[PDB]
Amino acid sequence: TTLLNPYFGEFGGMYVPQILMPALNQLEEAFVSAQKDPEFQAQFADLLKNYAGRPTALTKCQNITAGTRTTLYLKREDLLHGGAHKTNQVLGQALLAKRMGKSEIIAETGAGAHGVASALASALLGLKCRIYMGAKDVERQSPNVFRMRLMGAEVIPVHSGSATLKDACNEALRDWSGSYETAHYMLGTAAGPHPYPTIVREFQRMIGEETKAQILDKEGRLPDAVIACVGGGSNAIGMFADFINDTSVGLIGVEPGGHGIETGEHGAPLKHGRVGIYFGMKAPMMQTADGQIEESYSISAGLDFPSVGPQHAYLNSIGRADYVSITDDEALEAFKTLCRHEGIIPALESSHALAHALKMMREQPEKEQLLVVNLSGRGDKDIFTVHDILKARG
């Protein structure tokens, strides 16, 4: 029994061991209560504004669209405190934990952006935070790891299974089942069991709400399309949510194509996987023919996840949103182009979104189109990675 619908059509649900259901029901009730509480909303708004720095800019990119009929804006989540959109919903989830009287935080991270956001929020709000990241991720990401620890967080390397984001996800669920009385699990994307896909969307939806107000102010109409990269789905659903009922606005999600879809080394389960049940949800998965969860791949650590949030699977199935992929090489070109022509260093995750917008423009340069790319993060974390590639490539 739940207060809200755990499914988006066929996708979603609460596929957890029985012991975790009370934790999920408790969280749902606290969220429903908080959403009707003006005091909670005011506290959340205060932190977003005065701590994280919202609203974020909407930047018009003139140089990169010169000589075409594309007008391109970037929604500047790269300017949020912490350097990525992950901060928005960690602040909300940390307040929910406090509402519930919890004193501890568990979080998973792959890239480290969600982990750093979880640790910063925990430091600000007086929560004891432990981060699962998993050996392979911990072995690299020493910068983000040190920031996490430099903010008082416990970073726990997971050596279970492949020793990556999915196992990080696994060990987080493992820990929470025993600790949920004291600890809140601060899931980092719009995926997992209900009510997380719903909570994460609602605590990211100011991205799209601001974008709508800003485009209206600057252009006097809605965008033709808003474009975002899709790992688990949080930045994209945060940009999309407030435009879902504006049927003229295209919603384009960009999954990582890695070395190329045909290679099988990608992270695009929405369009190239098949529906499975894992991490508490029924959703598109990359999986072996036998139903083992496959390993994904992307140059960008933040998109390297073999599933996707269920609301994206739903919006795709009904034709409301369209999903595409961008390869490592396309994302790297977009990264270089934005640095050189606009003076903004984008995260490699966000570079996938930009690459697809550049394709929309280049393929049809006399098509009139007003596009917004969600620039979900800054690319300082990726400078060493891009350096080593361009040095290896020549």
Binding site: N170, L173, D290
Partner: protein
């Protein structure tokens, strides 16, 4: 078939608790696994719970995580597990065999088809570790259509609504994890309760039966014994037999 009902009737007639060990199929390899399982039976296991290796066993602790890794390291696939199950049943016609599954392996090629294969090979029950009662309808329905008992966990944080659903929905036995739980399950005519919470000593089996449960499942202790004896195939089977005998003796009183 009625393997569980027949077992519980025999045990009720002998004033006896069930003892049920868990092992991961193909741990540490197929042939050694088949011999391990034969040793458990010969040593007095009343029923078996058998895990199929899965890439991401999110409901398992470290003991069983590594059991899965050992199995994958030996190349074990669900299809090979189903071959093993047919061989086990061909050898042992009456012992109840339950699987511990993850949802994706059941859903992968169609839920109905999964439970049809279970029926074909002679499995008696399926516990899907990451399907709570709330999501269980297609699994329960498919199980019952193929004469497979769907097994549910009654956790220590269970409430009355949950107790009624578990009682109504489960068959074969109820996987426990208090007097309240046990008597209430009985009040709602639930499948006989097996205590499965950290069962590692003979005395815990005798405590479970005394509490009013129908017996006890040792969810990780067997795997521990495999773990500790990987270089000694001989001692492994030897310590396995000594353990199961002691646990099973504890269930006679």
């Amino acid at each position: 078939m009625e393997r569980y009902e027949n077992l519980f009737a025999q045990l009720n007639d002998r004033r006896e608790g069930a003892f049920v060990p868990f092992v991961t199929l193909g741990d540490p390899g197929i042939e050694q696994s088949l011999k391990i399982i034969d040793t458990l039976i010969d040593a007095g296991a009343d029923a078996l719970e058998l895990g199929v290796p899965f890439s991401d066993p999110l409901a398992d602790g470290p003991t069983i995580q590594n059991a899965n890794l050992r199995a994958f390291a030996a190349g074990v696939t669900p299809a090979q597990c189903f071959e093993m199950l047919a061989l086990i049943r061909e050898k042992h016609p009456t012992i109840p065999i339950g699987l511990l599954m993850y949802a994706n392996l059941v859903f992968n090629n169609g839920i109905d088809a999964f439970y049809a294969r279970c029926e074909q090979v002679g499995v008696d029950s399926v516990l899907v570790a990451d399907v709570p009662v709330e999501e269980s309808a297609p699994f329960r329905q498919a199980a019952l259509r193929h004469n497979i008992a769907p097994i549910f966990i009654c956790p220590p944080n269970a409430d009355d609504d949950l107790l009624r659903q578990v009682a109504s929905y489960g068959r074969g036995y109820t996987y426990l994890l208090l007097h309240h739980l046990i008597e209430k399950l009985k009040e709602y005519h639930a499948a006989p309760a097996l205590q499965g919470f950290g069962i590692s000593s003979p005395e815990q089996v005798s405590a479970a039966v005394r509490a009013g449960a129908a017996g006890a499942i040792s969810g990780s202790a067997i795997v521990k014994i495999i773990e500790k004896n990987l270089a000694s195939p001989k001692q492994m089977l030897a310590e396995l037999r000594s353990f199961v005998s002691a646990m099973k003796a504890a269930s006679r009183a």
